[PDB]
Amino acid sequence: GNYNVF
Amino acid sequence: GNYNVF
Amino acid sequence: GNYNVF
Amino acid sequence: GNYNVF
Amino acid sequence: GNYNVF
Amino acid sequence: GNYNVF
Amino acid sequence: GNYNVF
Amino acid sequence: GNYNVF
Amino acid sequence: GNYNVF
Amino acid sequence: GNYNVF
Q1: What distance in Å separates the CA atoms of residue J2 and residue J6, rounded to the nearest whole number?
Q2: What's the start-to-end Cα distance of chain J, in Å?
Q3: Which D residues in the span 1-6 are in contact with E, Cβ-Cβ below 8 Å?
């Protein structure tokens, strides 16, 4: 999966 | 899946 | 799935 | 599914 | 499903 | 409180 | 409170 | 509190 | 608190 | 606190 986490 | 989390 | 979470 | 959650 | 939740 | 539950 | 329940 | 639960 | 739970 | 949980 793709995770862009801030 | 795709997760863009802020 | 797609999750855009703020 | 698609989740846009604010 | 599609969930746009505010 | 605010509860949006699916 | 506010409850939106599905 | 705020609860958005899927 | 804020809870966005999937 | 803030909890975004998948």
Answers
A1: 13
A2: 16
A3: 1-6
